[model samples]
Target: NPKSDKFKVKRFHHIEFWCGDATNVARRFSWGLGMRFSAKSDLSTGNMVHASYLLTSGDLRFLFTAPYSPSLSAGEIKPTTTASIPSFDHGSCRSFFSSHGLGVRAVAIEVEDAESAFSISVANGAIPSSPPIVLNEAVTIAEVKLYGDVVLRYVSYKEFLPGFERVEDASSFPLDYGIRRLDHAVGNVPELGPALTYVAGFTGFHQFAESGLNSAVLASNDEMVLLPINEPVHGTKSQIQTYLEHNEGAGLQHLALMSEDIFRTLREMRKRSSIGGFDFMPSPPPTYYQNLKKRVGDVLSDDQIKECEELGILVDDDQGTLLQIFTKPLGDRPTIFIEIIQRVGGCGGFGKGNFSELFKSI
Candidate 1:
């Protein structure tokens, strides 16, 4: 019961990926995940320091930012006069981005009081990166450290961050993909205990942990914001260890995008893969199919099971059940990836029942 009453987090404001190239990665996520490329701020927008693209799907916002450091001479574009430029600036892209390669640099949470959130977080042992920066008279944001090089941003704004110009009519609701919102984000670390305590205390969210590859999943009471931290097991250099190595330290592992209709969502995603969409992991073996029915009696249709088996999608039960599948690593490194999930009933699990089978395929 570590849920904190200190800050009121409405939802995840956005997940910011500080990658090597925001331009091309935009295409990968837009077409592959069915998110719309809605807004941007770059040289074109007079943001001389970096390029930031905002992609939206339902209530989810995925911001991709690539810090720029040009050694040679350039054209007469001026840096953005906007006060929120620090929102995307990572300072010397070469040195900052090389270690982790491409990773999530910030996870912004929409909160009721931006200034108070910052004050309380630092007061409660959270590391401070930035004090409250007023974007406008009404909009304000602040940053505190999260995982390795990743910061937890507190945003109190009506629209997305300042300086971004929206390209599409945001009034359009519910795009074809049925991919709704972010369910949870997972990060890998050298150790889980301290990280879990820090985050839970910062957000006042309940913390749950595990061993043999020690881990903890921390979440807000409303459950809109979830962060799972993974620590490499001492006796082995396995999945979590491999992730920390390639990531160069603690960093985002995967983001679970909750879907309304995974059958259709996965079907369309697979169809688009040949044309540069995302690549899903290999499906589970036959025994998983053979023992599937025995694990749960008549919970899902035979057609549904067959569809999941064919698509590498997994079905697992907790308080209820969930249908899920994972993409291969987003880039060359095995750091960050995507998870498409469909929660059935009140199912809040993270495909725990399929962990063993998943590792086998991985």
Candidate 2:
């Protein structure tokens, strides 16, 4: 499994990516975020560079390195990178049928109660691919097969898992991104409305938040139409935004980064990225920023987060404060991007206020 349950603060261990021009990207990420650059590997050379960055917030880490290119140039560059986990991409699998494997597979979720959550989840809507069992004394795990195609695993542990988590006082520039625990696991339903209908039959799948056209939100009797998942501390709802930009049908799009400070992380990434020759830039706008405080209420920050506001960045607070931002081309052809999130305190939800604009923006 790509995710390891051997750590304490982090929900995930590492995220691996496959890019076309990997060397530049790898170096860019390392310099921009100060991630650990790997020393050597047998993967693509010229088009790739292997590296890993720790979040420092309890061991949360993002592992980004080289891409396997179908080129001969890689032979000339001896890479200072290594693969931490096995490759999920079809081209990198190295196995006989490696060509048919999906490039990315989000393997698991970390929970507070592995057994109880697993049992309840299985009793509700989750199909237990495997029962909750101990990965060791520190971790208990449960695996569920979603749609019979994707593997959705849940973990609950109390030791050194993997990846980087924020130190109690660690900070990111331009934004204050931190890892407090995973708010939720999000994925797309291909049939859109109907797929959600099927999943809503389970318990704990109730809508705790929502946004969009009042007409759309009001008109639908759909289970997930009105109720949505929101980040608790910040009350940001987990948004299931759709993009038909690329020919590929819907799948897992991106991860939402919950932070205690969005401004700090954004600032740090932007400044460091610029100096590193890779400016952190936002894609084209989907829509204008909407007045979110009315429905979401006063808990949303009143401070003028100019950078976020101008970009129509979304915000929502149910129990805690959360600020959110999304990335473009989730993949090279408008696929997935990493979400930088921060939570101060309260419920967790994708920023409900910015949904329309987000949908309209992209």
Candidate 3:
């Protein structure tokens, strides 16, 4: 475990999505993933630059934003789209959404001091995307480019970044499916070495584990932060390469959301998919589970293994065991998706032991 004294991240704060339709994406999350609308900012709320909707599930929050048009005040280049109108301070949002469709734009990490985090990261060879700036009273934020067009943002979590109207009726709709916190975020880069080095140097994360040469798992010692960075293998048509080609470049492949009761969580998710048009990854064959019992030995009982097999959950052991399942891509593009995971004991792994089967199933 590598702990940094200068810049310590508390945990994941929120993930922002640059999308063509913020409202629609928010609705999908609300209905499909059991998140609730928490807040909003748009022209009606006096935010003319961009429209945004905030959704919440447990401690996890997601911000969906779409540009009204291109920003001319900043002298930024504008895209000539019949659907575009200028609004925000930058043109990156429009271009990102236009190219990638709906995808993660930034993963915000909560830290004690955004300024110190930003400075130390920049000093360690991380590319700076934004200088530390005050969002409003009692809020500050800074950003650095991570992979593809995605950025890692350091934010002060004293209060929600200013300029959003609180949704008074932000009801926690019943059937809240057991998503706890962000377990880890997986990024598909061109290579594993540079990506791992960048994350370690930029945020003081240490390599927690490795899955051969094609993937590396990193985590923050001070916080429950995990990042599984992967790259395409040379002379092979790897899944990482497929993701890169389909995503148009390096980008987020999926996010693993922690679940306390994975069995219940997966059961509810599957139910929603069957009845609500929600989609999940295809199930692995029964042979995979039979092989799992032999591969991991007697870590799981017959009943537990049967339950997992029925739910299509995959498992691995470090000191203890970790259970996980992946969801299919959310949109037509094979880019962004979700993963449901549960750490049984203190096992801090990203289920690398099950990747071969997972790839075959995909």
Candidate 4:
């Protein structure tokens, strides 16, 4: 059970990535995922050091930050530095990128009160990265450590973060794929219990027991935000371990972007992939598709299943149905990536049945 009294997470405010090339990486997301380049902050906009770009799609926001100096020494970046929410220490971010390439640096959650969330989390064993800082007297933000280098940022704001200049005409970059919001954010850890308990102990997110074996899912009380944390098994040389090696330890592995229409979203995404959008992994073999009906039980029409098969989308169901597809690593390193997931018939389950088939695809 979660400690539902002291604090609660409403939903994800955004996921901010510490990148080496913020502009180009964001451009890729815009071109690839059809996210609008909504705002910018850097030397031009009075952000003293790093260049940060904020991209938006419907209610989803992704903030990308990078250092101004192109060639930053990895060792020079410190393990810990002064804590700032939106404005961060350049070295801390470079230090992260130095070890983990283009991976998630901060995951921000919407909370009722950022101050109390920080106070309770720190009291309950969460490491404090920053105290609550209010910007333009409008929003309050705080940070705690999660999944090794990843920052668990807590924020309370109405619309957007301050200190950024919004793009006046972002209409050029339309939301073609109709990505609605973040379905879930996942991390790979060396051990699951400690990470799970640590988060649950503080924020009061309950363990979503549908999880099995080496993975665990934690959900916000209302079930708006689902966090799936994975641990490496004792025996096999698992993909989780592979991620650890590449990331130089544990952190975010992938993000599931929820969509209203996966078929159309994937069609647009796949069309963009050949032109430099992130490439998806190869689909599982025909045998997997041959047995797809056994897994999904005609949740999708025969034509829909065929279309899913053609698009390399995997279908699975619990009480309801979900269709999903994964892209190859978002960065040059094979560390983290993205997933497009569409739910129908009120599906709340993650793909427990299709995981093996999904794994073998990569």
- Tens digit of per-residue lDDT, candidate 4, span 20-137: 8898899889889988888888777765457888888888899888876534323333333212244487668878888888889888899988988899999988889877877777
- Pairs with backbone N, CA or C atoms under 3 Å apart (clashes), candidate 1: 3-204, 4-204
**lDDT against the true structure, each candidate:** 0.77, 0.42, 0.75, 0.79
lDDT of 1 by residue, 1-362 (tens): 44555688888878888778898988778888888877888877767667888889888898888866653113422333432346544453455588877777888888998999999999988899778878757788899989788889998865676677777576433345888788888988887778888877767887643235767778776666888888777674478888887888888899888888888899889998778888888778766766666665478777767666788777774468777788888888887888998886225577765767545443
Each candidate structure's TM-score, on Cα atoms with residue i matched to residue i, is 0.89, 0.52, 0.88, 0.90
lDDT of 3 by residue, 60-84 (tens): 8888887665452233333432221
Arranged by lDDT, best first: 4, 1, 3, 2
Candidate 3 deviant stretches above 4 angstroms: 70-90, 170-175, 210-213, 274-277, 295-297, 345-348, 356-362
Tens digit of lDDT per residue, candidate 2, span 1-362? 12211212224433434434445655555555444443223332212323223322323444333335435334433223223222223343233112212223334544566677667666766666667665436666565554313444566766223221222332333222344333333444444354444344332333333342121111012221122211112134323322322413434445554455567656656566436523433633523334443433455444554356654455554467566665443333444455666666124545554445456544
What stretches of model 4 exceed 4 Å from their correct place? 1-5, 69-87, 170-172, 210-213, 356-362
| RMSD (Å) of each candidate, 1 decimal | 3.5, 10.5, 4.5, 4.3
Question: What lDDT, from 0 to 1, does candidate 2 have?
Answer: 0.42
- Candidate 3 — which pairs collide? 68-85, 69-85, 69-86, 70-86
Consecutive 10-residue window with the lowest summed lDDT within model 2: 213-222
